[PDB]
Ligand binder design. Structure first.
Ligand SMILES: Nc1nc2[nH]cnc2c(=O)[nH]1
Ligand SMILES: Nc1nc2[nH]cnc2c(=O)[nH]1
Lengths: 216, 216
């Protein structure tokens, strides 16, 4: 049976791409230079530097968004490099859209992959790689929560990266059944028109399932 | 046949570990802060900072050695964090042991995994993750060549990480037959005493082959 092993290998491909992104996100969240920039009071004079730094990562990871959420004097600051623009704002109280932060920082997870609409542009939704810094602020929250906001179209192109015979559909869903993107125990099911074979597997790094259809 | 697929999966495990190391090495070689420290003339005043920075990576990658080779005014400087010590020296001409540099910088490879004896301590030999910076100096050489020096004992523990049935031996060799470490088309060969099954596969990221023996 080539199809099950092929599904496992493609899942491994997705895993290694996300793992490169995750390692870079951890190194960014625990960056000594970013922590020193935070302790210095986040001077605007060095912002350009910071931008360049994040640029060097965006070129390597090919991700649309890069974000840094810093804590200083009890205030949270959200910075984002995207499309050459370096945007900055203040993190909102838990009653607004930034409650995700209060979520991830209240969980004991070192990292989570939460899908959410962008706070600078609510129209676009991204898959955010929230990684927590080892250092904690005086209020108990992570000093830095940095990572990469992935454009879901890329998600579509890297699952469309490999196709079995050039046909079939590959889908990636969430744990509640919310579908994220579209291009072990294998089963056979009759689809509308013609029958197909389906087989699913769950990714722990993404917290999310993966299905695939194949005909002849 | 479970053994071939198991060999492929363990090779994938080795690949993903080395890939985390490689991504961190690339981000370090193309670090904007390191490049600014180089352009500033490599001030000793900031050395502590640099050290801390590299420390933050060594804690994440669990690698014995971290190295940075910088170019400034036509002179090459070799820095290494290891065991809490921040060592620094001048890169030797091609007639000495640093010729590896002139090798890797003369190849069009973005990165190479060269095994070599340490230049600060010739007794210990490491597997060096040489990654080239995108920026080039005025003399045409990479402005920064940074990465991680892996202790081969770790290499032994991550191939001993997974064992089939708790028996058998897994070996990793070079392209000339030089064995690196010890714990597709499968073949059967009679070893001294009792017969065994052997199957090998080549890793492109490591440029190196992988064998494995199994009895019953
Ligand atoms: N909306 C939103 N923006 C983010 N920026 C970083 N992480 C997130 C997240 O989870 N949601
Ligand atoms: N000896 C030695 N030291 C290194 N430091 C970084 N790369 C190397 C290498 O290839 N050889």
């Amino acid at each position: 049976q080539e199809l099950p092993a092929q599904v496992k290998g493609l899942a491994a491909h997705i895993n290694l791409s996300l793992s490169q992104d995750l390692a870079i996100s951890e190194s960014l969240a625990n960056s000594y230079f970013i922590e020193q920039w935070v302790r210095e009071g986040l001077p605007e004079e060095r912002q350009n530097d910071i931008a360049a730094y994040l640029a060097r990562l965006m070129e390597q990871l090919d991700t649309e968004l890069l974000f840094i959420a810093a804590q200083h004097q009890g205030r949270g600051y959200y910075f984002q490099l995207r499309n050459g623009e370096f945007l900055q704002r203040i993190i909102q109280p838990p009653g607004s859209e930034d409650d995700w932060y209060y979520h991830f920082t209240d969980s004991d997870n070192a990292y989570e992959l939460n899908l959410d609409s962008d706070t600078f542009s609510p129209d676009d939704a991204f898959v955010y790689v929230n990684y927590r810094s080892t250092v904690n602020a005086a209020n108990g929250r992570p000093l830095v929560v940095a990572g990469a906001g992935l454009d879901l179209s890329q998600m579509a192109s890297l699952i469309d990266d490999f196709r079995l015979g050039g046909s079939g559909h590959a889908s990636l869903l969430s744990a509640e059944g919310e579908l994220l993107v579209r291009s072990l125990q294998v089963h056979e099911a009759t689809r509308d028109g013609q029958e197909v074979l389906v087989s699913t597997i769950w990714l722990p790094e993404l917290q999310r399932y993966l299905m695939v259809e194949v005909d002849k």
